[PDB]
Design a protein around this motif. Structure first.
Motif, PDB file in Angstrom:
ATOM      1  N   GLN A 102       0.839  -1.187   0.000  1.00 34.40           N
ATOM      2  CA  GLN A 102       0.000   0.000   0.000  1.00 34.40           C
ATOM      3  C   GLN A 102       0.879   1.243   0.000  1.00 34.40           C
ATOM      4  O   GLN A 102       2.009   1.226   0.492  1.00 34.40           O
ATOM      5  N   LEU A 103       0.351   2.321  -0.571  1.00 29.40           N
ATOM      6  CA  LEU A 103       1.065   3.585  -0.693  1.00 29.40           C
ATOM      7  C   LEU A 103       0.495   4.583   0.305  1.00 29.40           C
ATOM      8  O   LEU A 103      -0.712   4.842   0.308  1.00 29.40           O
ATOM      9  N   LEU A 104       1.366   5.142   1.143  1.00 30.08           N
ATOM     10  CA  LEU A 104       0.935   6.044   2.201  1.00 30.08           C
ATOM     11  C   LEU A 104       1.007   7.486   1.722  1.00 30.08           C
ATOM     12  O   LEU A 104       2.095   7.948   1.354  1.00 30.08           O
ATOM     13  N   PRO A 105      -0.099   8.226   1.709  1.00 23.35           N
ATOM     14  CA  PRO A 105      -0.032   9.639   1.327  1.00 23.35           C
ATOM     15  C   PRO A 105       0.482  10.499   2.469  1.00 23.35           C
ATOM     16  O   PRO A 105       0.091  10.334   3.629  1.00 23.35           O
ATOM     17  N   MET A 106       1.375  11.421   2.132  1.00 20.96           N
ATOM     18  CA  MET A 106       1.947  12.360   3.084  1.00 20.96           C
ATOM     19  C   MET A 106       1.564  13.779   2.670  1.00 20.96           C
ATOM     20  O   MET A 106       0.769  13.986   1.750  1.00 20.96           O
ATOM     21  N   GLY A 107       2.132  14.763   3.360  1.00 15.58           N
ATOM     22  CA  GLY A 107       1.904  16.145   3.018  1.00 15.58           C
ATOM     23  C   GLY A 107       1.691  17.033   4.225  1.00 15.58           C
ATOM     24  O   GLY A 107       1.634  16.571   5.368  1.00 15.58           O
ATOM     25  N   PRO A 108       1.573  18.341   3.987  1.00 16.44           N
ATOM     26  CA  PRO A 108       1.359  19.281   5.096  1.00 16.44           C
ATOM     27  C   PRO A 108      -0.052  19.213   5.660  1.00 16.44           C
ATOM     28  O   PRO A 108      -0.893  20.069   5.367  1.00 16.44           O
ATOM     29  N   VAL A 109      -0.314  18.196   6.479  1.00 18.00           N
ATOM     30  CA  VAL A 109      -1.664  17.971   6.984  1.00 18.00           C
ATOM     31  C   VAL A 109      -2.012  18.969   8.081  1.00 18.00           C
ATOM     32  O   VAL A 109      -3.074  19.598   8.045  1.00 18.00           O
ATOM     33  N   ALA A 110      -1.112  19.145   9.054  1.00 15.05           N
ATOM     34  CA  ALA A 110      -1.451  19.887  10.266  1.00 15.05           C
ATOM     35  C   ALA A 110      -1.626  21.379  10.014  1.00 15.05           C
ATOM     36  O   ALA A 110      -2.435  22.021  10.694  1.00 15.05           O
ATOM     37  N   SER A 111      -0.881  21.947   9.058  1.00 17.01           N
ATOM     38  CA  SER A 111      -1.040  23.364   8.737  1.00 17.01           C
ATOM     39  C   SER A 111      -2.434  23.652   8.199  1.00 17.01           C
ATOM     40  O   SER A 111      -3.044  24.670   8.547  1.00 17.01           O
ATOM     41  N   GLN A 112      -2.952  22.766   7.350  1.00 21.74           N
ATOM     42  CA  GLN A 112      -4.325  22.912   6.887  1.00 21.74           C
ATOM     43  C   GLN A 112      -5.319  22.594   7.997  1.00 21.74           C
ATOM     44  O   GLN A 112      -6.350  23.264   8.119  1.00 21.74           O
ATOM     45  N   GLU A 113      -5.015  21.586   8.825  1.00 20.56           N
ATOM     46  CA  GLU A 113      -5.950  21.123   9.849  1.00 20.56           C
ATOM     47  C   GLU A 113      -6.197  22.182  10.916  1.00 20.56           C
ATOM     48  O   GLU A 113      -7.334  22.351  11.378  1.00 20.56           O
ATOM     49  N   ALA A 114      -5.143  22.893  11.325  1.00 20.54           N
ATOM     50  CA  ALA A 114      -5.271  23.876  12.397  1.00 20.54           C
ATOM     51  C   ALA A 114      -6.177  25.030  11.988  1.00 20.54           C
ATOM     52  O   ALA A 114      -7.079  25.420  12.737  1.00 20.54           O
ATOM     53  N   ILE A 115      -5.970  25.574  10.786  1.00 20.10           N
ATOM     54  CA  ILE A 115      -6.829  26.661  10.326  1.00 20.10           C
ATOM     55  C   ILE A 115      -8.197  26.132   9.908  1.00 20.10           C
ATOM     56  O   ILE A 115      -9.194  26.861   9.972  1.00 20.10           O
ATOM     57  N   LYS A 116      -8.284  24.857   9.518  1.00 20.40           N
ATOM     58  CA  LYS A 116      -9.577  24.251   9.229  1.00 20.40           C
ATOM     59  C   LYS A 116     -10.450  24.190  10.474  1.00 20.40           C
ATOM     60  O   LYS A 116     -11.652  24.473  10.415  1.00 20.40           O
ATOM     61  N   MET A 117      -9.859  23.829  11.610  1.00 13.70           N
ATOM     62  CA  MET A 117     -10.622  23.809  12.851  1.00 13.70           C
ATOM     63  C   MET A 117     -10.833  25.205  13.423  1.00 13.70           C
ATOM     64  O   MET A 117     -11.906  25.495  13.961  1.00 13.70           O
ATOM     65  N   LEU A 118      -9.833  26.085  13.321  1.00 12.23           N
ATOM     66  CA  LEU A 118      -9.955  27.419  13.901  1.00 12.23           C
ATOM     67  C   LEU A 118     -10.971  28.265  13.145  1.00 12.23           C
ATOM     68  O   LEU A 118     -11.858  28.878  13.750  1.00 12.23           O
TER      69      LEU A 118
END
Ligand code: CDL
Ligand code: CDL
Ligand code: ATP
Ligand code: K
Ligand code: K
Ligand code: K
Ligand code: K
Ligand code: K
Ligand code: K
Ligand code: K
Lengths: 190, 557, 27, 674
Positions: B212-228
């Protein structure tokens, strides 16, 4: 210019900051502080990547602790899809899939109870659930015990050692990391 | 079960006010045009560098500034998504998007809706996710808080015509509220195990052997402003179900706190800026009563769950299908109600897998106009419209002129309030009518019977009410669906922002009087119940037939 | 979308436009 | 209640009110279009359309026409009540307006001339038992005129020339001697003729509150029309689509037809109630602006109590003889016309009678006392015996040799402590002391002021006295504030100061010195005793000369606003029961599992829809008397009134629609129509 200079200046500055400073500062801070967490929590065999500690893999063997079903595209537990089953509560297709899963779990576990836990027959929200409840783990004890010739108290000790509890009992559920549990079983065998 | 759910609600709504009182004072300081301590010199230097100094523009120029910034961001985001192949930071060599999908997601991210008809990890590149989506989440949240800043300034200002500087407000919000709290939330996400790497996709040699191929990337930078900012546009196809985004129940609790952090703090800021905290207490009491009722109803529905599970043979009948096992059905119900009443749209459980009555309440919570801690400022001005309606009804019912915090609410304000109330039910009903009588609109089905119409209604409601939450069984990648939802999101943002700014322009020109003996107080349990009844009656009298053909029919089936 | 659907959509759109005009210009 | 002699003709007026006159009311135009299209659908459906049972569609069309007829019955009946009141009081001048003069002082050669084109400047002399031709004022003479044909009471009222009671109206014929009348304005455009003209030539003249409520009703109509028109594409895919007539029936049952049809009836019925309270108002905007006023301007004399001061008091001061003080008082008062003054000096006469005081006006002149002059000086032989107020006495003896000891200051301080009107009349530079004038403050005024002070009603009054006695009288009366030293420019300054804070001003003026206040006052009434210069420069006038009824004017205006709000809440709250009656019945074939929502266990879907339409039609004819009369009004605070209204109109509006639909469905089942 009709006041287009403050508009363009504000948009360019906010673009530059929130797309080249905040992600960049968070990236360097994360990779400096918690690089194992920031790099996927990959479990390695020295050079061979056995999988992330959060993703969860498709386990079908008798000696492996089976996780929740996954409805990801093109294969179960596909990380490239990450989409759970969107079948309604009044869907005959969902009823047939749950019936097939209950029949398969009952055939795979003859020594367990006649009632199967909910997590083993219902698909997860993302199809990438690495976690099952300790009740389902205790339900899956006898099949793995008969397959691996390991004692029930040893399997219970291993499960309790690889079980995570939340800060309080009500913001989540007790969970069992099935990839780490199966890797622990493989390391115990050899 | 019930005790655990009640304890969860109690600790959530306790830590929420605990964390929202000082942010409320800070947002009140930003409303009152007083800079935060220790930051005025850097602010003055930055404003002199940017040429965004004191202008003190009126409501028309404020509205033109907000719309100009939003359309410029829309053009930049649309061209970035249409031309992501030539842009750097693309380790998977993902191709450029189609015109319909690119326009739909550009309007979705601009209008603070964040509807995702695509799969993120196989559709969007690292550069797109890191730059364009994140800056557009920041800009949409800042625009919403700037519009509600203008409305609160209009309520607190006497006999003026100006409404502050829109660029000053946007820069102040983004640099002193959004970014540092997003840094704290993202670093807590890396503490708990999220992603903040730019590494390529990692191949995995599975224990059994199925690679299986694991996707990576800048998750937390989007997640923090997504929740805020209550944005809702996740990194992957799962908005928050994916373990690289929400790995821990503590992380989920922090996400819920970040979702309700800004609307509660803005209610506190409004109450403090008016000088009477009883108004913010009234708003928070009404929102909290509706929120607790909805949360309890959805928790009871999901604990009741699928009745067929014991028939086919299961340990319990709880509707854990489509829910992550890291969170209970109680926690999934709470997250569903939080992100659907708050116009967030993120999901830790797929709402399509919810029961009929359990997904009934998210549909109604979008369709009421998103007034229960909705958006960041969108819910506060929607609740302001409902408060204007309630004080009009109360003034007629007591025989006085309709007023609220001294300002007399006149015919032009009633006209604009009526139009802003009218915009989003018209949008959801018109879009659902269009999508329910076309082959392209009816061919995106996954569930038959009333639940398919429930899927269509949920999609159009999330588009119109700027939610973006999806049942995700709808195949909304069609060009017709993308264009219809893009039109719905565009009108649902900018046919509601415009009359609120016109209401603010009508509000600045008036003068507020004092509180007399015959002046009805706009606080207390009587006005809380009147406002709750107004919201429930308005949101029900439009959508009881639609919910009756949808989730009510599915439940009674 | 037969002629009945077309005339129903036309009548509903005419009523909606009339009501919107009445709300905008209510004397 | 229901006068058949106007119902029988205004029903024909309603029958003529249907075509193209429903376009002004948007809710009424929507229900009219729905009725017309449903009637056309039933007509084509009974002849050549595929769906059957067109009798149900015909009954739906009939009841949808009946509800429009009932709303038009409400509006027309209230308008006709207003017209009937105007025609009842329009008979003040109908025939033989042919009275004139030749000489402006005392003319002859009285003949028949048309007086409908006379400009200001003509003088008309009226004899006994002749109708006054036009409004104006008396110049010479004075007589006991009657006002029975215009006002309520049939008691004659006296008139005087050169005084405050100088105003005539072309109403009841005068049952007294000769009286000259100066023509104020040309007949036709006066206040009374203008209001009869604008009632007969009826103008809608939507108030801003009515426009805002109409905008709310249009928004409700838009959301209900969208939610009803979207039902057909919703239910077409899920089975068999609902019929169009059921959709139109649900749309009519949903939209606020009650308040939408009763809004104009409420407005013109509140105007009719104003005309029934002997108050004639220009505009319903002024009627509603009379409600929700902050300050309430009155005066200490008349509105509070007329007083009729009866107190003969002495002084322990440097004056030699109180007998000589009474001698000076009766020398000053030989032909006194003011009632309180003549009562005070007749009390002084019975205290100590004076010989040779046989109305000696041959060698003495008379100076009239007004509000602007405040002076009534009488020269007997060579002296100037004083009668003015304290400020006027200070002003005129501050010029020529006068001075003030502190003893008169402690005397007027004692008078203020007792509570009275201080008169400090003297002869010249010699100070003769003070005479206290005790006024009664009787009447049921404190209870109504206490019940009005809960309502956000400041009750500042203009006493026209010093600041101490006014403070004492205001404190014992119970009003909020007070104003002393009455002056028209001071009244203008106070009114503009109160209006600069966003606070409405309610006031009352009679003379021409109050005319700028009548002009730049938010709401203001003027009695019949006032002149044309104040009657035509004010928002409102009073048919009966009683300046104490502006409180019930405020009550009636607040009744109008509360009736509008209560019926709006009733119309909004009925829709829950409309859903519970129609929605489980409309989808009786598309989704058969929806019959569990029928909580009233109604018989059949068509009977349920028909019963809902019958209730929606009959609620207007049942709420006829509430709209014509007003809500059950009580003097409570804002929160108590809000919770009482939310109880009654807001729990009845959620309960009695269920009972009404259940009773109508049971009656239809018993009759066997369905
Ligand atoms: C079923 C129908 C529907 C029902 C829905 C009901 C709605 C529920 C939510 C209520 C909405 C309230 C809206 C107003 C906002 C409140 C903010 C505010 O101003 O507060 C003061 C305000 C009253 O003060 P005031 O004098 O009017 O205000 C003057 C000043 O401006 C302020 O005076 P102050 O400075 O003294 O203010 C207090 C101060 C306090 O200072 C701080 O704590 C902050 C500073 C210290 C930081 C560090 C402290 C760490 C945490 C504190 C806890 C101590 C340690 C304990 C450890 C556990 C936690 C780690 O700072 C705060 O403002 C923080 C807020 C904390 C109190 C309010 C919490 C609200 C919700 C509480 C539980 C929610 C129940 C949901 C379940 C409902 C189901 C029926 O509070 C209220 O309005 C009352 C709210 C309390 C709710 C009671 C009724 C709810 C229903 C009953 C359920 C049982 C409740 C408890 C359950 C617990 C489990 C058994
Ligand atoms: C609809 C049909 C019927 C409606 C009519 C009913 C209305 C009146 C009811 C009773 C009146 C009878 C007279 C008895 C005397 C007063 C009794 C009393 O205390 O009652 C409180 C109050 C009325 O009294 P008040 O005039 O405010 O003055 C007395 C207060 O004590 C003075 O207040 P205060 O400011 O001095 O504060 C004192 C304090 C303490 O005084 C009390 O209230 C008494 C003791 C209570 C607890 C002790 C304090 C503890 C603090 C925590 C609070 C616990 C609540 C937590 C659980 C929440 C439960 C939902 O109040 C507090 O509770 C403190 C917290 C402040 C806010 C709390 C809000 C909690 C939620 C309550 C209402 C939510 C209802 C949801 C459903 C609404 C309908 C859908 O009644 C209500 O609670 C009203 C609820 C319903 C309002 C009307 C509903 C309208 C719905 C239809 C809308 C129209 C159609 C749409 C039109 C537009 C569409 C286009
Ligand atoms: N005949 C009179 N001659 C001179 N002064 C008088 C006479 N009658 C009353 N006054 C005094 O003139 C002042 C006017 O007070 P008062 O309250 O009677 O005013 P008004 O002119 O009748 O009208 P209002 O009460 O509406 O202001 C008082 O000080 C009163 O004592
Ligand atoms: K959103
Ligand atoms: K979303
Ligand atoms: K809204
Ligand atoms: K709405
Ligand atoms: K929003
Ligand atoms: K919105
Ligand atoms: K509305």
């Amino acid at each position: 210019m009709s006041g287009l200079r403050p508009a363009l200046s504000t948009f360019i500055f906010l673009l530059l900051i929130t797309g080249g400073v905040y992600p960049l500062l968070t990236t360097v801070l994360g990779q400096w502080w918690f690089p194992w967490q920031a790099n996927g929590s990959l479990i390695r065999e020295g050079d061979t990547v056995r999988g992330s500690a959060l993703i969860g893999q498709n386990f079908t063997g008798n000696g492996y602790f089976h996780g929740r079903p996954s409805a990801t595209a093109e294969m179960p537990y596909n990380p490239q899809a990450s989409g759970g089953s969107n079948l309604a509560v009044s869907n005959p297709e969902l009823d047939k899939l749950i019936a097939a899963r209950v029949a398969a779990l009952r055939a795979a576990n003859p020594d367990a109870s006649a009632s199967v836990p909910v997590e083993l027959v219902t698909a997860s929200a993302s199809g990438l659930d690495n976690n099952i409840t300790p009740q389902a783990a205790a339900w899956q004890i006898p099949r793995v015990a008969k397959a691996r010739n390991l004692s029930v108290e040893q399997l219970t000790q291993l499960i309790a050692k690889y079980s995570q509890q939340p800060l309080v009992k009500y913001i989540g559920q007790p969970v069992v990391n099935i990839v780490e549990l199966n890797l622990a079983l493989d390391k115990l065998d050899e | 079960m019930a005790a655990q759910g009640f304890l969860l609600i109690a600790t959530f709504l306790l830590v929420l006010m605990v964390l929202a009182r000082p942010l409320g004072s800070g947002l009140a300081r930003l409303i009152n045009d007083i800079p935060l301590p220790g930051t005025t010199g850097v602010e003055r230097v930055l404003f002199r560098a940017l040429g965004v100094s004191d202008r003190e523009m009126n409501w028309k120029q404020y509205l033109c500034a907000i719309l100009g910034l939003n359309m410029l961001g829309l053009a930049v985001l649309f061209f970035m998504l249409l031309g992501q192949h030539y842009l750097p930071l693309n380790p998977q060599q993902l191709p450029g998007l189609s015109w319909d999908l690119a326009l739909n997601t550009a309007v979705s991210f601009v209008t603070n809706t964040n509807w995702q008809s695509y799969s993120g990890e196989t559709t969007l590149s690292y550069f797109s996710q890191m730059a364009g989506l994140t800056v557009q989440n920041f800009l949409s949240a800042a625009s919403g808080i700037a519009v509600i800043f203008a409305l609160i300034r209009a309520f607190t200002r006497q006999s003026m015509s100006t409404l502050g500087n829109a660029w000053v407000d946007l820069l102040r919000i983004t640099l002193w509220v959004l970014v540092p709290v997003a840094l704290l939330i993202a670093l807590f996400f890396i503490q708990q195990g999220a992603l903040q790497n730019f590494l390529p996709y990692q191949a995995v040699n599975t224990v059994e052997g199925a690679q299986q191929l694991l996707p990576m990337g800048p998750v937390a930078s989007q997640e923090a402003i997504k929740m805020l900012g209550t944005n809702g546009g996740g990194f992957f196809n799962a908005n928050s179900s994916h373990p690289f985004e929400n790995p821990t129940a503590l992380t989920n609790f922090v996400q819920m706190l970040a979702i309700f952090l800004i609307p509660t703090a803005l209610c506190f800021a409004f109450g403090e800026v008016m000088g009477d905290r009883r108004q913010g207490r009234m708003l928070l009491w009404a929102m909290s009563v509706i929120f607790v009722i909805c949360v309890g109803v959805v928790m009871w529905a999901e604990v009741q769950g699928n009745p067929h599970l014991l028939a086919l043979g299961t340990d319990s009948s709880i509707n854990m299908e489509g829910k992550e096992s890291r969170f209970g059905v109680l926690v999934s119900s709470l997250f569903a109600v939080v992100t659907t009443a708050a116009s967030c749209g993120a999901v830790i459980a797929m709402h399509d897998s919810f029961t009929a009555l359990g997904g009934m309440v998210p549909m109604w919570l979008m369709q009421i106009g998103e007034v229960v801690f909705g958006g960041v400022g969108s819910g506060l001005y929607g609740m302001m419209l409902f408060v204007l309606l309630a004080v009009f009804i109360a003034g007629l019912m007591i025989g006085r002129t309709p007023e609220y915090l001294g300002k007399k609410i006149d015919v032009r304000e009633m006209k604009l309030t009526a139009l802003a109330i009218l915009v989003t039910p018209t949008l959801v009903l018109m879009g659902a009518a269009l999508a329910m009588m076309t082959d392209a609109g009816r061919s995106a089905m996954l569930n038959p019977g009333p639940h398919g119409f429930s899927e269509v209604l949920y999609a159009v409601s999330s588009a119109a009410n700027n939610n973006g939450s999806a049942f995700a069984g709808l195949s909304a990648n069609s060009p017709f669906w993308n264009c219809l939802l893009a039109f719905c999101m565009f009108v649902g943002r900018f046919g509601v922002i415009i009359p609120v700014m016109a209401i603010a322009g009508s509000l600045v020109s008036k003068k507020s009087q004092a509180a007399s003996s015959g002046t009805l107080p706009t606080h207390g349990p009587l006005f809380v119940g009147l406002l709750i009844g107004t919201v429930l009656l308005v949101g029900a009298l439009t959508f009881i037939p639609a919910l009756a053909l949808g989730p009510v029919a599915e439940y009674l089936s | 979308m037969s002629a009945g659907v077309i005339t129903g959509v036309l009548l509903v759109f005419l009523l909606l436009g009339y009501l919107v005009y009445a709300l905008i210009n209510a004397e | 209640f229901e006068p058949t002699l106007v119902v029988q003709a205004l029903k024909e007026a309603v029958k003529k009110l249907n075509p193209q006159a429903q376009w002004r009311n948007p809710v009424m135009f929507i229900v009219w279009i729905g009725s017309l299209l449903t009637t056309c659908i039933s007509i084509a459906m009974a002849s050549g359309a595929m769906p059957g049972n067109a009798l149900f569609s015909a009954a739906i069309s009939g009841w949808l026409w009946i509800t429009v007829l009932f709303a038009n019955f409400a509006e027309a009946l209230a308008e006709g009540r207003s017209k009937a009141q105007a025609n009842s009081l329009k008979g003040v001048k109908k025939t033989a307006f042919a009275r004139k003069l030749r000489e402006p002082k005392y003319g002859a050669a009285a003949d028949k001339v048309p007086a409908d084109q006379l400009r200001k400047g003509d003088i008309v002399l009226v004899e006994a038992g002749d109708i006054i031709p036009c409004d104006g004022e008396v110049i010479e003479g004075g007589a006991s005129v009657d006002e029975s044909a215009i006002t309520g009471e049939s008691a004659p009222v006296i008139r005087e020339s050169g005084g405050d009671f100088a105003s005539v109206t072309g109403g009841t014929r005068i049952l007294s001697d000769w009286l000259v009348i100066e023509c104020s304005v040309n007949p036709g455009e006066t206040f009374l003729d203008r209001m009869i003209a604008m009632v007969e030539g009826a103008q809608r003249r939507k108030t801003p509150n009515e426009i805002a409520l109409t905008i709310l009703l249009i928004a409700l109509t838009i959301v209900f029309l969208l939610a009803t028109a979207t039902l057909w594409p919703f239910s077409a895919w899920g089975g068999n689509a609902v019929s169009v007539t059921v959709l139109v029936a649900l749309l009519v049952c949903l939209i606020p037809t009650t308040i939408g049809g009763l809004l104009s009836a409420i407005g013109v019925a509140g105007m009719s109630r104003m005309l029934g309270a002997n108050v004639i108002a220009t505009s319903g905007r002024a009627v509603e602006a009379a409600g929700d006023v902050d300050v309430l301007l009155l005066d200490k004399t008349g509105t509070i109590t007329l007083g009729n001061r009866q107190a003969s008091e002495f002084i322990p001061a440097q004056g030699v003889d109180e007998k000589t003080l009474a001698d000076a008082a009766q020398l000053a008062s030989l032909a006194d016309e003011t009632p309180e003054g003549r009562s005070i000096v007749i009390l002084a006469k019975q205290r100590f009678n004076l010989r040779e005081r046989d109305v000696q006006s041959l060698h003495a002149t008379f100076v009239p006392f007004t509000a602007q002059s405040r002076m009534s000086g009488i020269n007997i032989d060579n002296r100037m015996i004083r009668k003015g107020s304290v400020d006027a006495i200070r002003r005129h003896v501050e010029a020529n040799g006068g001075h003030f000891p502190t003893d008169v200051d402690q005397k007027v301080d004692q008078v203020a402590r007792q509570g009275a009107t201080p008169l400090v009349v003297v002869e010249g530079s010699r100070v003769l002391g003070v005479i206290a004038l005790k006024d009664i403050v009787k009447g049921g005024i404190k209870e109504r002021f206490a019940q009005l002070r809960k309502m956000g009603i400041k009750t500042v009054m203009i006493t026209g006295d010093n600041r101490l006695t006014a403070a004492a009288i205001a404190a014992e009366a119970g009003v909020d504030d007070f104003l002393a030293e009455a002056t028209p420019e001071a009244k203008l300054a106070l009114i503009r100061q109160y209006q600069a804070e966003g606070r409405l001003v309610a006031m009352t003026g009679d003379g021409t010195n109050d005319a700028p206040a009548l002009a730049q006052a938010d709401v203001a009434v003027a009695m019949n005793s006032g002149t044309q210069a104040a009657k035509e420069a004010g928002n409102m006038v009073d048919l009966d000369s009683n300046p104490t009824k502006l409180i019930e004017v405020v009550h009636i205006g607040k009744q109008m606003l509360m009736t509008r709000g209560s019926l709006t809440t009733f119309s909004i709250a009925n829709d829950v029961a409309k859903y519970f009656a129609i929605i489980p019945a409309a989808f009786a074939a598309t989704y058969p599992q929806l019959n569990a929502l029928n909580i009233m266990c109604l018989h059949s879907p068509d009977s349920a829809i028909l019963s809902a339409v019958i209730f929606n039609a009959l609620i207007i004819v049942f709420l006829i008397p509430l709209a014509l009369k007003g809500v059950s009004y009580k003097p409570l605070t804002a929160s108590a009134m809000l919770r009482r209204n939310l109880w009654i109109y807001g729990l009845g509006g959620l309960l009695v629609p269920f009972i009404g639909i259940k009773v109508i469905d049971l009656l239809l089942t018993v009759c066997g129509l369905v």
